[PDB]
C-alpha cells in the first residue's frame, strides 16, 4: 500500500495534491435533499467538498465518506492544522479523497 | 455543487438565511414524542429545531453537529432554515470565527 | 412545536421538570442484563436513569435512547451544566425524557 | 431499579466491585485474530478487559459492548478518574460489566 | 486471555512489537476507492497503516482502530507500543497500547 498521501494520490487519474498548511476557516454542513454534503474553506482562498454519496462510490467508500465528514467537523472545531489534501480535481468544488494533518 | 451556504439555500423553496454570528445559548434534546427533537436558542431570542437512508444519516449528523457546537461554545455564522415549520427547521449550518 | 423544555414536558403524562442548574457529579454505565442502564447523580442527591425499556423494539426509539446516553457521557466529561431534566416520574430512579443545557 | 453501581453489582452472583479512585494507567486495543479486545490497567496492578464473548450474538448486547469500549477510550484520553468497576469474575482478566466515574 | 500487548502480539505469525513512546506527528485518512486506509507517522520516521477492510466483527474492529488513532492524534496522546503485521507495506497495526 502507499506510505504517504502524495504516493496514494499518484495512484488515481483525476487527483491532485494541495499543500494547505492551515486550519479550516469555515465549515458548512447541509442535510437538504440531494445536497447532503460538507464544504470547507481556508483563509488562503481554497474551497473543498465531501461529495453527496452516489454511483461514483463503491460500498467500502460509504462508511469512509461518513468518516471523512466526522474528521472535517472535529478538525474544524479543534483548529487542527491540515498539511495536505488529495482531491478529485474534476469536481466543483474539488472533492476530498484524502486528508493529512500535521503541526 | 454550491460553494457557500447562501448559494445552497437559494436552490430550495421555503428556505431563508438567518445571520447569527453567535454561539448557541441553549441546547434541548427530547425523546418524549414520536420523533426525537433537538431545539437550539440564541441570546437574540431566535429558536430553531432539527427535522431515504441518506436523509436519515444527514439528520443524525446535524443533531450531532449542534450538540458539539453547543458544548465547544463555537460561533455559528449562518443558518439556512425551512420557514414553513415552527420553530424553523435547520437545512444547513455554517461556522466561522 | 414546543420552544422550551418546560413547554415540551407539559405535553406528556407522568412527566415532571427537575431544575438542576449543575454539572453531573457521577456517571455510571452498565451492560449487566438487558436494561443497559446509564445512571447520573448530582451533588443535590438526585439520581436519574436512561434505560432501554423491555417493551421498546422500534428502531428510531432505540437510536434516540443511544443519542441520549451519548449526550449524558459527553456532558459529564466536559463538566457541562444541566439546566433542566424532563423525567418520567413512575420509574425509580426517574427516567430522562428530555434534557436542556444553558450557561 | 438500582440507584448505584454497588446496588446494581449486588444483583449478580458472578460480579464483584473493585473500588479504583484513579485514572486509567494504560489502554490497550487489539484486533489481532478473531475477537477485538480492550484491556485497561491501573497503577495498583489491577487489569480488566472488554470483549464480545464468542457465544454472544444479540445486537442490543453488541451495541452495549461497543459503547463500553468507547467509554474506556475517552475516559483514558481525558485522564478521567474511575470511582468503581463492577466486573465478571468468571474469567481473567476480569470483564467489565459496569463503570462509575466521579471526581 | 492475554493481559499485555506483548502477550497478544506473540499469538500470531508475522507480528512484531514496535516501542514508540511518542505522540503521532501526522494522521492521514483516505476515502479513495480500494484505499480506504489510515496512515500515521512519527517524527522518529516510522510510518504505519490501518489496512483496507474479513468477517463483520473484523470490519468493526478496523473502524474502531481508525477512530482511536484520530482521537489519539488530536489529543497529542503518547503511544507506548504498536503490535504490527510486519509482512505488509507499510507495517499494518494489529494492536496499540498507550501509557504516560
Ligand atoms: C474513458 C477512458 O479513457 N477509460 C479507460 C479506462 O480508464 C479507467 C476507468 O475504467 C473504467 O472501466 C472501463 C473498463 O476498463 C472498460 O473495459 C470498459 O469497456 O469501459 C469501462 C468504462 O470506462 C472504470 O469504470 C473506471 O472507474 C471509475 O473511475 C472514475 C474515475 O474516472 C471514478 O470516479 C471518481 O469517483 C470519485 C469518488 O469515488 C470522485 O467522485 C471523482 O470525482 C470521480 O471521477 C469511479 O469511482 C470509478 N468507478 C469504479 C466502479 O471503480 C476507471 O477505472 O482504462 C481502460 C484500461 O486502461 C481503458 O481501456 C483501454 O482503452 C483503449 C482505448 O482508449 C484501448 O481500447 C485499450 O485496448 C483498452 O484497455 C479505458 O479506455
Ligand atoms: Na474559494
Ligand atoms: Na483559537
Ligand atoms: Na475556536
Ligand atoms: Na462551556
Ligand atoms: Na466559556
Ligand atoms: Na447487556
Ligand atoms: Na476541570
Ligand atoms: Na455481585
Ligand atoms: Na497527563
Ligand atoms: Na474533569
Ligand atoms: Na521513539
Ligand atoms: Na494540538
Ligand atoms: Na502541540
Ligand atoms: Na493528556
Coordinates of C-alpha atoms and ligand atoms in Angstrom, one line a residue:
Chain A
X1 CA 0.0 0.0 0.0
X2 CA 1.1 3.7 -0.4
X3 CA 3.2 5.1 2.6
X4 CA 2.3 8.8 2.1
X5 CA -0.7 10.9 0.9
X6 CA 1.4 12.0 -2.1
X7 CA 2.0 8.3 -3.2
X8 CA -1.7 7.5 -2.6
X9 CA -2.8 10.5 -4.8
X10 CA -0.4 9.4 -7.6
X11 CA -2.4 6.1 -8.0
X12 CA -5.6 7.8 -9.4
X13 CA -6.3 9.6 -12.7
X14 CA -8.2 12.7 -11.7
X15 CA -6.4 13.6 -8.4
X16 CA -4.1 16.4 -7.3
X17 CA -2.2 17.3 -4.1
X18 CA -2.8 20.7 -2.5
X19 CA -0.4 21.8 0.2
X20 CA -2.6 23.7 2.7
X21 CA -0.5 24.1 6.0
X22 CA -3.5 25.8 7.7
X23 CA -6.6 25.3 10.0
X24 CA -10.1 25.4 8.4
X25 CA -11.6 28.9 8.2
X26 CA -15.2 27.8 7.7
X27 CA -17.3 24.6 7.9
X28 CA -20.6 24.2 6.2
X29 CA -22.9 21.2 6.6
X30 CA -26.1 20.6 4.6
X31 CA -28.9 17.9 5.1
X32 CA -31.0 19.5 2.2
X33 CA -32.3 16.8 -0.1
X34 CA -29.7 15.7 -2.8
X35 CA -27.2 18.1 -1.2
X36 CA -26.2 16.0 1.9
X37 CA -22.6 17.5 1.8
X38 CA -19.9 19.3 3.7
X39 CA -18.0 22.3 2.4
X40 CA -14.7 23.7 4.0
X41 CA -12.8 26.9 3.1
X42 CA -9.4 28.2 4.0
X43 CA -8.3 31.9 4.5
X44 CA -5.8 31.2 1.6
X45 CA -8.9 31.1 -0.6
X46 CA -9.4 27.3 -1.3
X47 CA -12.8 25.7 -1.1
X48 CA -13.4 21.9 -1.0
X49 CA -16.4 19.5 -0.6
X50 CA -17.1 16.0 0.6
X51 CA -19.5 14.8 -2.2
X52 CA -23.1 13.6 -1.8
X53 CA -22.9 9.7 -1.9
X54 CA -23.7 8.3 -5.4
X55 CA -22.7 5.8 -8.1
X56 CA -19.1 7.2 -8.2
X57 CA -18.7 5.4 -4.7
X58 CA -18.3 1.6 -4.2
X59 CA -19.8 0.0 -0.9
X60 CA -16.4 0.3 1.0
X61 CA -16.5 4.1 0.4
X62 CA -20.0 4.7 2.1
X63 CA -18.5 4.3 5.6
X64 CA -15.4 6.2 4.6
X65 CA -17.5 9.2 3.3
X66 CA -19.2 9.3 6.8
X67 CA -15.8 9.1 8.5
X68 CA -14.3 11.9 6.4
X69 CA -17.3 14.2 7.3
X70 CA -16.7 13.3 11.0
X71 CA -12.9 14.1 10.6
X72 CA -13.5 17.5 8.9
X73 CA -16.0 18.6 11.7
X74 CA -13.6 17.7 14.6
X75 CA -10.6 19.2 12.7
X76 CA -12.6 22.5 12.3
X77 CA -13.7 22.6 16.0
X78 CA -10.2 21.8 17.4
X79 CA -8.5 24.4 15.0
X80 CA -6.2 21.5 13.9
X81 CA -3.8 22.3 11.0
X82 CA -4.3 20.4 7.7
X83 CA -1.0 19.6 5.9
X84 CA -2.1 18.3 2.5
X85 CA -5.3 17.3 0.7
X86 CA -5.6 14.8 -2.1
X87 CA -8.6 15.9 -4.2
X88 CA -10.5 14.8 -7.2
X89 CA -9.9 17.9 -9.4
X90 CA -12.8 17.1 -11.8
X91 CA -15.5 18.2 -9.3
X92 CA -16.9 21.7 -8.4
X93 CA -15.5 22.5 -5.9
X94 CA -12.6 20.0 -5.7
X95 CA -13.7 16.8 -3.8
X96 CA -11.6 15.4 -0.9
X97 CA -10.2 11.9 -1.5
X98 CA -7.6 12.1 1.5
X99 CA -6.5 14.4 4.2
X100 CA -3.3 14.7 6.2
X101 CA -3.0 16.6 9.5
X102 CA 0.4 17.7 10.9
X103 CA 1.6 20.5 13.2
Chain B
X1 CA -22.3 21.8 -6.2
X2 CA -22.9 25.2 -4.3
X3 CA -19.7 26.7 -2.8
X4 CA -21.5 28.7 0.1
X5 CA -24.4 28.3 2.4
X6 CA -26.1 31.3 0.7
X7 CA -25.8 29.7 -2.8
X8 CA -27.1 26.3 -1.4
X9 CA -30.1 28.0 0.4
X10 CA -31.1 29.8 -2.9
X11 CA -31.7 26.3 -4.6
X12 CA -34.7 25.5 -2.4
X13 CA -38.3 26.8 -2.0
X14 CA -39.4 27.8 1.6
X15 CA -35.9 28.4 2.8
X16 CA -34.1 31.6 4.1
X17 CA -30.8 32.6 5.6
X18 CA -30.5 33.7 9.2
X19 CA -27.2 35.5 10.0
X20 CA -26.5 34.5 13.7
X21 CA -22.8 35.5 14.4
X22 CA -23.1 33.9 17.9
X23 CA -22.7 30.8 20.0
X24 CA -25.7 28.7 20.9
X25 CA -27.3 29.8 24.2
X26 CA -29.3 26.7 25.0
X27 CA -29.5 23.1 23.7
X28 CA -32.6 20.9 24.3
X29 CA -32.9 17.2 23.3
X30 CA -36.2 15.3 23.7
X31 CA -37.1 11.6 23.1
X32 CA -40.6 12.0 24.6
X33 CA -42.5 12.2 21.2
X34 CA -42.8 10.1 18.0
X35 CA -39.7 11.8 16.6
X36 CA -36.5 12.8 18.6
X37 CA -36.4 16.7 18.6
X38 CA -33.3 18.9 19.1
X39 CA -34.0 22.6 19.8
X40 CA -31.4 25.4 19.9
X41 CA -31.9 29.0 21.1
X42 CA -29.7 32.2 20.8
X43 CA -29.4 35.2 23.1
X44 CA -31.3 37.2 20.2
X45 CA -34.4 35.1 21.1
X46 CA -34.3 33.0 17.9
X47 CA -35.2 29.3 18.2
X48 CA -34.6 26.5 15.6
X49 CA -35.2 22.7 15.5
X50 CA -33.9 19.7 13.6
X51 CA -36.5 18.0 11.4
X52 CA -34.5 7.7 2.3
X53 CA -31.4 6.3 4.2
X54 CA -29.1 9.3 3.1
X55 CA -31.6 11.8 4.6
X56 CA -31.8 9.8 7.9
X57 CA -27.9 9.8 8.2
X58 CA -27.8 13.6 7.5
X59 CA -30.4 14.3 10.2
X60 CA -28.4 12.3 12.7
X61 CA -25.2 14.1 11.7
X62 CA -26.9 17.6 12.1
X63 CA -28.1 16.7 15.6
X64 CA -24.5 15.5 16.4
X65 CA -23.1 18.8 15.0
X66 CA -25.5 21.0 17.0
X67 CA -24.6 19.2 20.3
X68 CA -20.8 19.5 19.8
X69 CA -21.1 23.1 18.5
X70 CA -23.1 23.9 21.8
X71 CA -20.6 22.1 24.1
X72 CA -17.5 23.8 22.4
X73 CA -19.2 27.3 22.5
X74 CA -18.4 27.5 18.7
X75 CA -19.8 30.6 16.9
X76 CA -22.5 29.9 14.2
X77 CA -22.2 32.2 11.1
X78 CA -25.4 31.4 9.2
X79 CA -28.3 29.0 9.2
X80 CA -30.3 28.0 6.2
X81 CA -33.8 27.1 7.5
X82 CA -37.1 25.8 6.3
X83 CA -39.5 28.7 7.3
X84 CA -42.7 26.5 6.9
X85 CA -42.0 24.8 10.3
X86 CA -42.4 26.3 13.8
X87 CA -39.8 26.6 15.1
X88 CA -37.9 26.9 11.8
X89 CA -36.1 23.7 10.8
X90 CA -32.3 23.7 10.0
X91 CA -31.4 22.7 6.4
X92 CA -27.7 23.9 6.7
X93 CA -25.3 25.4 9.1
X94 CA -22.1 27.4 8.6
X95 CA -19.5 28.1 11.3
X96 CA -16.6 30.7 11.0
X97 CA -14.5 32.6 13.6
Chain C
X1 CA -43.9 22.5 18.2
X2 CA -42.7 23.5 21.8
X3 CA -39.9 26.1 22.0
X4 CA -38.7 25.2 25.6
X5 CA -38.2 22.1 27.7
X6 CA -40.9 23.4 30.2
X7 CA -43.5 23.6 27.3
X8 CA -42.4 20.2 25.9
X9 CA -42.6 18.5 29.3
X10 CA -46.2 19.9 29.9
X11 CA -47.4 17.9 26.7
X12 CA -46.7 14.4 28.3
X13 CA -48.4 12.5 31.1
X14 CA -46.3 11.1 34.0
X15 CA -43.5 13.7 33.3
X16 CA -42.2 16.4 35.6
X17 CA -39.4 19.1 35.4
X18 CA -36.4 18.9 37.7
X19 CA -34.4 22.1 37.7
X20 CA -30.8 21.0 38.2
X21 CA -28.5 24.1 37.4
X22 CA -25.4 21.9 38.0
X23 CA -22.8 19.6 36.4
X24 CA -23.2 15.8 36.8
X25 CA -21.4 14.6 40.0
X26 CA -21.3 10.9 38.9
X27 CA -21.8 8.9 35.7
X28 CA -22.5 5.1 35.8
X29 CA -22.8 2.9 32.6
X30 CA -23.9 -0.7 32.9
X31 CA -24.2 -3.6 30.3
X32 CA -25.4 -6.0 33.0
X33 CA -28.6 -7.7 31.8
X34 CA -30.9 -6.0 29.3
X35 CA -31.9 -2.5 30.6
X36 CA -28.3 -1.3 29.7
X37 CA -28.7 1.5 32.3
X38 CA -26.9 4.8 32.5
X39 CA -27.3 6.5 35.9
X40 CA -26.4 10.1 36.7
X41 CA -26.3 11.7 40.2
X42 CA -26.0 15.3 41.3
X43 CA -24.5 16.9 44.5
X44 CA -28.2 17.7 45.4
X45 CA -28.6 13.9 46.0
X46 CA -31.0 13.4 43.0
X47 CA -30.4 10.4 40.8
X48 CA -31.8 9.7 37.2
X49 CA -31.5 6.9 34.6
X50 CA -31.7 6.3 30.9
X51 CA -32.6 2.7 30.2
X52 CA -33.8 0.5 27.3
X53 CA -37.4 -0.4 28.2
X54 CA -38.3 -4.2 28.0
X55 CA -41.3 -3.2 25.7
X56 CA -39.1 -1.0 23.4
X57 CA -38.4 -2.6 19.9
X58 CA -38.9 0.4 17.4
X59 CA -35.5 1.3 15.7
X60 CA -36.0 5.1 15.8
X61 CA -36.7 5.0 19.6
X62 CA -33.6 2.8 20.2
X63 CA -31.4 5.4 18.2
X64 CA -32.9 8.3 20.3
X65 CA -32.0 6.3 23.6
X66 CA -28.4 5.8 22.3
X67 CA -28.2 9.5 21.5
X68 CA -29.3 10.5 25.0
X69 CA -26.7 8.1 26.5
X70 CA -24.1 9.8 24.3
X71 CA -25.3 13.2 25.4
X72 CA -25.0 12.3 29.2
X73 CA -21.5 10.9 28.8
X74 CA -20.0 13.9 26.9
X75 CA -21.9 16.3 29.3
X76 CA -20.3 14.5 32.2
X77 CA -16.7 14.5 30.7
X78 CA -16.9 18.2 29.6
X79 CA -18.3 19.3 33.1
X80 CA -21.2 21.0 31.3
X81 CA -24.0 22.4 33.4
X82 CA -27.5 20.8 33.0
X83 CA -30.4 23.4 33.3
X84 CA -33.5 21.1 33.5
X85 CA -34.5 17.5 33.1
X86 CA -37.9 16.4 32.0
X87 CA -38.4 12.9 33.6
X88 CA -40.9 10.0 33.7
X89 CA -41.7 10.0 37.4
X90 CA -43.3 6.5 37.5
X91 CA -39.8 4.8 37.5
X92 CA -37.1 4.6 40.3
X93 CA -34.8 6.3 39.6
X94 CA -36.8 8.7 37.4
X95 CA -36.1 8.1 33.7
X96 CA -35.0 11.0 31.5
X97 CA -37.3 12.1 28.6
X98 CA -35.6 15.4 27.8
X99 CA -32.5 17.4 28.8
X100 CA -31.7 21.2 28.5
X101 CA -28.2 22.8 28.9
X102 CA -27.6 26.5 29.3
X103 CA -24.8 28.5 30.9
Chain D
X1 CA -34.1 -0.3 39.5
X2 CA -30.7 0.1 41.3
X3 CA -29.6 3.7 42.0
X4 CA -25.8 3.0 42.4
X5 CA -23.2 0.7 40.8
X6 CA -22.8 -1.1 44.2
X7 CA -26.6 -1.9 44.2
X8 CA -26.5 -2.9 40.6
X9 CA -23.4 -5.2 41.1
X10 CA -25.1 -6.9 44.1
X11 CA -27.9 -8.3 41.7
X12 CA -25.4 -10.7 40.0
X13 CA -23.6 -13.7 41.7
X14 CA -20.6 -13.7 39.4
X15 CA -19.8 -9.9 39.7
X16 CA -17.8 -8.0 42.3
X17 CA -16.9 -4.3 42.9
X18 CA -13.4 -3.0 42.6
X19 CA -13.0 0.5 44.1
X20 CA -10.4 2.3 41.9
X21 CA -10.5 6.0 42.8
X22 CA -7.9 6.6 40.0
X23 CA -7.4 7.4 36.3
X24 CA -6.5 4.5 33.9
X25 CA -2.7 3.9 33.6
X26 CA -2.7 2.0 30.3
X27 CA -5.2 1.4 27.5
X28 CA -4.6 -1.5 25.0
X29 CA -6.8 -2.1 21.9
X30 CA -6.3 -5.3 19.8
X31 CA -7.9 -6.6 16.6
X32 CA -5.3 -9.4 16.3
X33 CA -7.0 -12.7 15.3
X34 CA -10.7 -13.4 15.9
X35 CA -12.0 -11.3 18.8
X36 CA -11.4 -7.5 19.3
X37 CA -10.4 -6.8 22.9
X38 CA -9.7 -3.7 25.0
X39 CA -7.5 -4.1 28.2
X40 CA -7.1 -1.4 30.9
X41 CA -4.6 -1.4 33.8
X42 CA -4.2 0.8 36.9
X43 CA -1.1 1.8 38.9
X44 CA -2.4 -0.7 41.6
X45 CA -1.5 -3.5 39.1
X46 CA -5.2 -4.5 38.5
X47 CA -6.1 -5.4 34.9
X48 CA -9.6 -5.6 33.2
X49 CA -11.0 -6.3 29.7
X50 CA -14.0 -5.6 27.5
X51 CA -14.5 -8.1 24.6
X52 CA -17.5 -9.5 22.7
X53 CA -17.9 -13.1 24.0
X54 CA -17.8 -15.9 21.3
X55 CA -21.3 -17.1 22.4
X56 CA -22.8 -13.5 22.2
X57 CA -24.9 -12.9 19.0
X58 CA -27.8 -10.4 20.1
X59 CA -27.4 -6.9 18.5
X60 CA -28.5 -4.9 21.7
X61 CA -25.8 -6.7 23.7
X62 CA -23.2 -6.0 21.0
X63 CA -24.2 -2.2 21.0
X64 CA -23.7 -2.0 24.8
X65 CA -20.2 -3.7 24.4
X66 CA -19.2 -1.2 21.7
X67 CA -20.4 1.7 24.0
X68 CA -18.3 0.4 26.9
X69 CA -15.2 0.2 24.6
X70 CA -15.9 3.9 23.5
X71 CA -16.3 4.9 27.2
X72 CA -13.0 3.3 28.3
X73 CA -11.1 5.0 25.4
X74 CA -12.4 8.6 26.1
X75 CA -12.1 8.1 29.9
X76 CA -8.4 7.1 29.3
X77 CA -7.7 10.0 26.8
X78 CA -9.4 12.7 29.1
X79 CA -7.5 11.3 32.2
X80 CA -10.9 11.0 33.9
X81 CA -11.0 9.3 37.4
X82 CA -12.8 6.0 37.7
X83 CA -14.7 5.5 41.0
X84 CA -15.8 1.8 40.8
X85 CA -15.9 -1.1 38.4
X86 CA -18.4 -3.9 38.6
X87 CA -16.7 -6.9 36.9
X88 CA -17.5 -10.5 36.0
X89 CA -15.0 -12.7 38.0
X90 CA -15.8 -15.7 35.6
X91 CA -12.5 -15.2 33.6
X92 CA -9.1 -13.3 33.7
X93 CA -8.6 -10.6 33.0
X94 CA -12.0 -9.8 34.7
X95 CA -14.6 -8.5 32.2
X96 CA -16.2 -5.1 32.9
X97 CA -20.0 -5.1 33.5
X98 CA -20.3 -1.5 34.7
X99 CA -18.2 1.6 35.3
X100 CA -18.8 4.6 37.5
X101 CA -16.9 7.9 37.3
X102 CA -16.8 10.7 40.0
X103 CA -14.3 13.5 40.9
Chain E
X1 CA -6.7 -14.4 28.0
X2 CA -3.6 -12.2 27.3
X3 CA -3.0 -9.3 29.7
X4 CA -0.4 -7.3 27.7
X5 CA 0.2 -6.1 24.1
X6 CA 3.4 -8.2 24.1
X7 CA 1.4 -11.4 25.0
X8 CA -1.3 -10.6 22.4
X9 CA 1.3 -10.0 19.7
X10 CA 3.1 -13.3 20.4
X11 CA -0.1 -15.4 19.5
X12 CA 0.2 -14.7 15.7
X13 CA 2.7 -15.3 12.9
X14 CA 4.1 -12.2 11.0
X15 CA 3.7 -9.8 14.0
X16 CA 6.3 -7.5 15.7
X17 CA 6.3 -5.1 18.6
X18 CA 7.5 -1.5 18.0
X19 CA 8.4 0.6 21.0
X20 CA 7.2 4.1 20.1
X21 CA 7.0 6.2 23.4
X22 CA 5.7 9.2 21.3
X23 CA 2.8 11.2 20.0
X24 CA 1.7 10.9 16.4
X25 CA 3.3 13.6 14.1
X26 CA 0.8 13.1 11.2
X27 CA -2.6 11.5 10.6
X28 CA -3.7 10.7 7.0
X29 CA -7.2 9.3 6.2
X30 CA -8.3 8.2 2.7
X31 CA -11.8 7.5 1.2
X32 CA -10.3 6.8 -2.3
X33 CA -11.8 3.5 -3.8
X34 CA -9.8 0.3 -2.7
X35 CA -7.5 2.5 -0.5
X36 CA -9.9 3.4 2.4
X37 CA -7.0 3.4 4.8
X38 CA -5.3 5.4 7.6
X39 CA -1.6 6.3 7.7
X40 CA 0.2 7.5 10.8
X41 CA 3.8 8.9 11.0
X42 CA 6.1 9.7 13.9
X43 CA 8.9 12.4 13.9
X44 CA 11.3 9.5 14.6
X45 CA 10.5 8.4 11.0
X46 CA 8.2 5.3 11.5
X47 CA 5.1 5.0 9.2
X48 CA 2.2 2.6 9.8
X49 CA -1.2 1.9 8.2
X50 CA -4.6 0.6 9.3
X51 CA -5.4 -1.6 6.3
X52 CA -8.4 -1.6 4.0
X53 CA -11.1 -3.9 5.3
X54 CA -12.6 -10.2 7.0
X55 CA -16.0 -11.0 8.7
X56 CA -18.2 -8.2 10.1
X57 CA -16.5 -8.3 13.6
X58 CA -13.1 -7.7 12.0
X59 CA -14.5 -4.8 9.9
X60 CA -16.0 -3.1 13.1
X61 CA -12.6 -3.5 14.8
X62 CA -10.8 -1.8 11.8
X63 CA -13.3 1.1 12.0
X64 CA -12.7 1.3 15.8
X65 CA -8.8 1.4 15.4
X66 CA -9.1 4.2 12.8
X67 CA -11.4 6.1 15.4
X68 CA -8.8 5.5 18.1
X69 CA -5.8 6.8 16.0
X70 CA -7.7 10.0 15.1
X71 CA -8.6 11.0 18.7
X72 CA -5.1 9.9 19.9
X73 CA -3.6 12.3 17.3
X74 CA -6.0 15.2 18.1
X75 CA -5.3 14.9 21.9
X76 CA -1.5 14.6 21.4
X77 CA -1.5 11.4 23.5
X78 CA 1.7 9.3 23.7
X79 CA 1.6 5.8 22.2
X80 CA 3.7 3.2 24.2
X81 CA 3.8 0.2 21.8
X82 CA 2.3 -1.0 18.5
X83 CA 1.8 -4.6 17.5
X84 CA 2.1 -4.7 13.7
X85 CA 1.8 -7.2 10.8
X86 CA 5.4 -6.9 9.6
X87 CA 4.6 -8.5 6.2
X88 CA 2.5 -5.5 5.0
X89 CA 3.7 -2.2 3.4
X90 CA 3.8 -0.1 5.4
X91 CA 3.6 -2.2 8.6
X92 CA -0.2 -2.7 9.5
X93 CA -1.4 -2.0 13.1
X94 CA -2.9 -5.1 14.8
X95 CA -2.9 -3.5 18.4
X96 CA -2.0 -0.3 20.2
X97 CA -1.0 0.4 23.8
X98 CA -1.0 3.9 25.5
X99 CA 0.7 4.8 28.8
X100 CA 2.1 8.2 30.1
Ligands
LIG1 C1 -12.8 6.6 -20.5 C2 -11.4 6.0 -20.5 O1 -10.5 6.5 -21.1 N1 -11.4 4.8 -19.9 C3 -10.3 3.9 -19.9 C4 -10.1 3.2 -18.5 O2 -9.9 4.2 -17.5 C5 -10.1 3.7 -16.2 C6 -11.6 3.6 -15.9 O3 -12.1 2.3 -16.4 C7 -13.5 2.1 -16.2 O4 -13.8 0.8 -16.7 C8 -13.9 0.7 -18.1 C9 -13.3 -0.7 -18.5 O5 -11.9 -0.7 -18.2 C10 -13.5 -1.0 -20.0 O6 -13.1 -2.3 -20.3 C11 -15.0 -0.8 -20.3 O7 -15.2 -1.0 -21.7 O8 -15.3 0.6 -20.0 C12 -15.3 0.9 -18.6 C13 -15.9 2.3 -18.5 O9 -14.9 3.3 -18.9 C14 -13.9 2.2 -14.7 O10 -15.3 2.1 -14.6 C15 -13.4 3.5 -14.2 O11 -13.7 3.5 -12.8 C16 -14.3 4.7 -12.3 O12 -13.3 5.7 -12.5 C17 -13.8 7.1 -12.2 C18 -12.7 8.0 -12.5 O13 -12.6 8.3 -13.8 C19 -14.2 7.1 -10.7 O14 -15.0 8.3 -10.5 C20 -14.5 9.2 -9.5 O15 -15.1 8.8 -8.2 C21 -14.6 9.6 -7.1 C22 -15.3 9.0 -5.9 O16 -15.0 7.6 -5.8 C23 -14.8 11.0 -7.3 O17 -16.2 11.4 -7.2 C24 -14.3 11.5 -8.7 O18 -14.7 12.9 -8.8 C25 -14.8 10.6 -9.8 O19 -14.1 11.0 -11.0 C26 -15.2 5.9 -10.3 O20 -15.2 5.9 -8.9 C27 -14.7 4.6 -10.8 N2 -15.7 3.5 -10.6 C28 -15.4 2.3 -10.2 C29 -16.5 1.3 -10.2 O21 -14.3 1.9 -9.9 C30 -11.9 3.7 -14.4 O22 -11.2 2.7 -13.7 O23 -8.9 2.4 -18.6 C31 -9.0 1.3 -19.5 C32 -7.8 0.4 -19.3 O24 -6.7 1.3 -19.3 C33 -9.1 1.9 -20.9 O25 -9.1 0.8 -21.8 C34 -8.3 0.9 -23.0 O26 -8.9 1.7 -23.9 C35 -8.1 1.9 -25.1 C36 -8.8 3.0 -25.9 O27 -8.6 4.3 -25.3 C37 -7.9 0.6 -25.8 O28 -9.2 0.2 -26.3 C38 -7.3 -0.5 -24.8 O29 -7.4 -1.7 -25.5 C39 -8.1 -0.5 -23.5 O30 -7.5 -1.3 -22.5 C40 -10.3 2.8 -21.0 O31 -10.4 3.4 -22.3
LIG2 NA1 -12.6 29.6 -2.7
LIG3 NA1 -8.5 29.7 18.8
LIG4 NA1 -12.2 28.3 18.2
LIG5 NA1 -18.7 25.9 28.5
LIG6 NA1 -16.5 29.5 28.2
LIG7 NA1 -26.3 -6.1 28.2
LIG8 NA1 -12.0 20.6 35.4
LIG9 NA1 -22.2 -9.2 42.5
LIG10 NA1 -1.2 13.9 31.9
LIG11 NA1 -12.6 16.8 34.8
LIG12 NA1 10.5 6.8 20.0
LIG13 NA1 -2.8 20.4 19.0
LIG14 NA1 1.1 20.8 20.2
LIG15 NA1 -3.3 14.1 28.2

